Amino acid sequence: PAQSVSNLYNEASGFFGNGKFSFETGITYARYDIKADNWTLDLTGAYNLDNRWQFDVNVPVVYRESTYSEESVSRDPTIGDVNFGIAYKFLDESATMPDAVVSVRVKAPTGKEPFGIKLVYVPESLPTGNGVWSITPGLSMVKTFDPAVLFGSVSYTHNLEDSFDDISSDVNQKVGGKVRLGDSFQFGVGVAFALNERMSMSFSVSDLIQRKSKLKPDGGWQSIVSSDANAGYFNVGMTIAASNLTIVPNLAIGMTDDAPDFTFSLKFPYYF
Amino acid sequence: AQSVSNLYNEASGFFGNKFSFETGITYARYDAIKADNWTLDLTGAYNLDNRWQFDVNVPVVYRESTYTSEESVSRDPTIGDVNFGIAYKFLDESATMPDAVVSVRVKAPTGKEPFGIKLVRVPESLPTGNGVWSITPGLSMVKTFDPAVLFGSVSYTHNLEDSFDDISSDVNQKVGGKVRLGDSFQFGVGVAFALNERMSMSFSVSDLIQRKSKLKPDGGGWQSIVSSDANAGYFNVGMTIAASENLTIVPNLAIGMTDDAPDFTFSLKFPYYF
Amino acid sequence: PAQSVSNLYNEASGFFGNGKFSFETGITYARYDKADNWTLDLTGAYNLDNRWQFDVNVPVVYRESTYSVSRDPTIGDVNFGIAYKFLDESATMPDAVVSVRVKAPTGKEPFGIKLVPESLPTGNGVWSITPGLSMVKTFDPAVLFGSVSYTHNLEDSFSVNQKVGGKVRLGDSFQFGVGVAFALNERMSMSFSVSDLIQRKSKLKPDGGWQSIVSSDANAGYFNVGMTIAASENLTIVPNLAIGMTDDAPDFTFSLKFPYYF
Ligand SMILES: CCCCCCCCOCCOCCOCCOCCO
């Protein structure tokens, strides 16, 4: 099973199932237009049991400079909302069947919370995480139809309701409350080709819908306006085989207002 | 070559593979005022000796727009502007020469006119059409340079003048009048490959330029509307997928480039070919 | 050979490999949001032995910035370019090339214009040395390729009720891109690429002290889909869509160019 195909399948299927363990460094620039430059170092380890089950942690690391006639704000490399996945390959591909993988991705509020950030207007700091617990079930198909590998994916992210000491952006008020960050549905599809024994290329489109954030001061449920979100991405990416070592570059053209203008990913999946 | 022919149908606008029925779900996202527009197209088409083609399209228009606080407007499954189309394929592809099709698109103002809709200060309602007739002549050429299939396409939209009971956005007033919607030009090109016996992919570009719109209130004079004209630009990525070689699944992303065009537009078309 | 893999390189690399004298004429449309810009680029070129290439480019610019101001066709910023290949590709190496472009301020400078403003400019109005490195390399069938450049702008001396006059320093600019290309058949190729221009801020000193212009800083992301189609033995047709990504690019840009190899 040549590395172009197997790198292509890993990337698409979300299921690092070439070896038995796997560690991966990723670096991701994103550009928001408030002008804003955001880099993101990801660190991600995964192990495999019975060719069929996968477990993994991911640790994100976040530098962030936002500019607001103009004044600058910063956040130096902090975590990160740490997330762990479990994944299960319920269907192995055949002529009649696709490859299929159900998964669940719990994510925890380890990063700096966006709530309580006062306004000395320009923020006194920038966040690194939305401040709540998420749980994201998800599905992904992949099937080779020589020489196009078609692939696709759905997921839904329930956030869990949490409470907070301070939720006033105003510089004089400790107004405590609690927050339901509303749910999201995430859809995406695309097609990939094994260009040669080592290289593979992919075109894909994904979209993300967030269903509006309710809030409750210590008061009644007053939902945050402007908080619901559509986020459209268009992606061109390879897949370049190096050694066990691999480089995976990707561009993400921001089709929506809420998605960043573009985003350059450079991932380095390494397999023991 | 099932995908060659599915590519051409799609590129040309000319069903080669007698009768054709086509159901077409489309989503489109505007955000400049946020808006989520769903369209459903029923289309039926006859084809005569791969030479003449008549067809009819019936759009159906769900719509939802959003204007500290902020109200929303909606618009339940109302049908849009129906249209009949005659296309004549005057060149056959050869070594020397392309695959040429010339066509007219007669488009009738069945949908809910935008004019009159009183702005309840946010609209009272959302339109489903432009309220005027229009005939749009067009050309489309398609030529292989194996395995690259080049294609092109150009059209002009002449809108006819029409009278309305009310052209005013005011709730408090009713001024009837006439309108000339500014005519529009539409150029676009692209390339397409057959990936296998069932599938094709496409990369394409397109532009729509529109002349400005004029009103005439009674009994005043013609007055053109500022910032009414537009240049809607689009980048397309697409595929053909022969499903039962009879059924064809046609997905297509469309990335808006210009503020005048929808942020994106996903499309699904299910040509059924008899 | 082949004629595509040739023309593939010559766009990616910016280097006339397979020719002595070369002349390229091209037309470019760009929409902003309202403005409409066309540019006619007349490029001449000589190349010595897949090793040195010299080239002259004259831009001629027609613009319509609808607030409604025009600027009838007029010469832009004429530029020339010494360019030198320093690695020819092997199984191991890439086709590397180093380049230096001087761009002289032959276009109408933007600094004079008084605020609908009187006229539209057709050039930044200062000189600029502009070095840069290219790579191309075939990993059958993928031709990977990439670019890097800095852009030093030179200082010069030179708003309506009043009329002040002094020195200006245009921001320096780093640029870089990457892309895969394909040889589709004997006559034609297809490309895909990305690039981001990063313009540093711009100081201005009245006849006074150096004041940064807030806003003059910029980031111009672009995404490009392209082709080379071989017409004659020596005429390529080079179409290229360039979808802008950030607010500082144009919404879009088509370019048709026609390099003839004489
Ligand atoms: C809260 C988590 C963020 C939402 C991500 C959901 C995406 C799940 O889609 C399944 C397919 O994913 C494709 C690539 O994912 C790789 C991540 O796992 C690394 C294993 O090597």
Side-chain angles (χ1 to χ4, degrees), chain C residues 1-15 17 19-32 35-45 47-63 65-114 117 119-128 130-154 156-160 165-166 168-199 202 205-206 208-210 212-213 215-232 234-235 237-246 248-253 255-262:
Chain C
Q3 197 177 4
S4 43
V5 174
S6 269
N7 286 306
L8 196 169
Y9 271 82
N10 322 341
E11 299 299 315
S13 57
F15 202 76
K20 266 192 139 216
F21 194 71
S22 189
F23 184 75
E24 182 188 276
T25 194
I27 187 69
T28 318
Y29 175 56
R31 180 86 196 145
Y32 301 93
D36 281 326
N37 299 19
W38 307 71
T39 296
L40 186 72
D41 251 31
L42 286 77
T43 337
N47 169 65
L48 278 53
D49 324 298
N50 291 68
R51 188 81 49 253
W52 295 88
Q53 162 187 281
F54 308 77
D55 46 79
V56 78
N57 185 248
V58 195
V60 205
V61 172
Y62 169 45
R63 310 181 59 188
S65 287
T66 312
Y67 287 71
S68 193
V69 197
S70 284
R71 161 54 79 177
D72 299 309
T74 323
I75 299 285
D77 280 342
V78 184
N79 60 99
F80 83 108
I82 322 197
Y84 165 66
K85 182 163 287 173
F86 67 95
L87 290 164
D88 283 279
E89 97 166 54
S90 51
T92 98
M93 304 275 148
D95 276 288
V97 190
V98 53
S99 171
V100 178
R101 183 155 301 273
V102 180
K103 173 221 77 84
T106 75
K108 300 301 189 185
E109 95 300 328
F111 302 112
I113 293 161
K114 316 214 191 278
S119 40
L120 307 193
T122 186
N124 70 329
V126 304
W127 292 78
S128 47
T130 322
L133 157 57
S134 135
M135 323 294 175
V136 193
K137 179 149 215 311
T138 299
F139 306 88
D140 203 355
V143 180
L144 309 198
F145 66 76
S147 323
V148 180
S149 76
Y150 196 68
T151 312
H152 185 60
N153 264 241
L154 283 59
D156 261 298
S157 95
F158 298 89
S159 315
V160 58
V168 176
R169 292 167 163 178
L170 283 185
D172 289 343
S173 161
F174 193 85
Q175 291 124 262
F176 53 93
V178 163
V180 43
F182 301 96
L184 295 166
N185 67 3
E186 263 287 339
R187 294 204 156 279
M188 51 199 85
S189 85
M190 190 160 179
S191 174
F192 296 94
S193 66
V194 54
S195 63
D196 183 45
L197 196 152
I198 295 181
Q199 163 72 312
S202 309
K205 180 180 165 285
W210 292 105
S212 285
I213 295 152
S215 81
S216 39
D217 69 295
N219 174 288
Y222 292 82
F223 172 75
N224 318 271
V225 179
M227 287 196 78
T228 72
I229 305 171
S232 314
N234 30 25
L235 163 79
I237 311 188
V238 184
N240 187 81
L241 175 58
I243 306 170
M245 312 186 104
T246 63
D248 298 46
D251 293 347
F252 69 77
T253 310
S255 20
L256 267 173
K257 306 178 323 184
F258 300 88
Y260 205 93
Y261 303 100
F262 231 137

Side-chain angles (χ1 to χ4, degrees), chain A residues 9-15 17 22 24 44-46 54-58 83-85 87 101 103 105-108 134-140 152-157 186 208 267 269 271:
Chain A
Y9 262 95
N10 290 176
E11 180 70 5
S13 80
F15 190 93
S22 59
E24 171 191 357
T44 316
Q54 148 172 328
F55 312 72
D56 59 60
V57 151
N58 174 283
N83 53 114
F84 46 107
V101 183
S103 70
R105 188 153 277 292
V106 174
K107 180 224 74 183
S134 100
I135 188 173
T136 313
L139 183 75
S140 98
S153 53
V154 59
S155 72
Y156 148 82
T157 292
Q186 305 109 64
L208 198 156
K267 320 187 322 185
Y271 304 71

Side-chain angles (χ1 to χ4, degrees), chain A residues 52-111 113-117 119 123-160 162-164 166-167 169-172 175-186:
Chain A
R52 179 75 61 179
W53 284 85
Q54 148 172 328
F55 312 72
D56 59 60
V57 151
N58 174 283
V59 180
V61 196
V62 179
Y63 171 86
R64 271 218 51 190
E65 197 173 350
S66 296
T67 305
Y68 307 94
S69 300
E70 72 175 9
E71 158 95 34
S72 277
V73 182
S74 188
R75 158 55 60 210
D76 302 316
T78 342
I79 31 159
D81 286 5
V82 176
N83 53 114
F84 46 107
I86 307 97
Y88 179 66
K89 182 168 291 197
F90 66 96
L91 278 166
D92 291 326
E93 191 182 339
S94 64
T96 65
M97 302 280 208
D99 198 54
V101 183
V102 70
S103 70
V104 173
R105 188 153 277 292
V106 174
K107 180 224 74 183
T110 74
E113 84 286 63
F115 304 95
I117 300 188
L119 301 159
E124 288 197 307
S125 61
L126 318 178
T128 52
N130 67 347
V132 309
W133 283 80
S134 100
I135 188 173
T136 313
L139 183 75
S140 98
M141 304 307 115
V142 191
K143 198 171 167 26
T144 290
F145 309 102
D146 197 325
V149 195
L150 290 168
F151 73 78
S153 53
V154 59
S155 72
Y156 148 82
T157 292
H158 184 60
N159 299 321
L160 301 163
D162 223 350
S163 317
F164 298 92
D166 184 13
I167 73 164
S169 53
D170 189 294
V171 75
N172 298 277
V175 180
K178 65 172 82 186
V179 192
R180 286 167 192 160
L181 288 196
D183 296 355
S184 57
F185 166 85
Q186 305 109 64

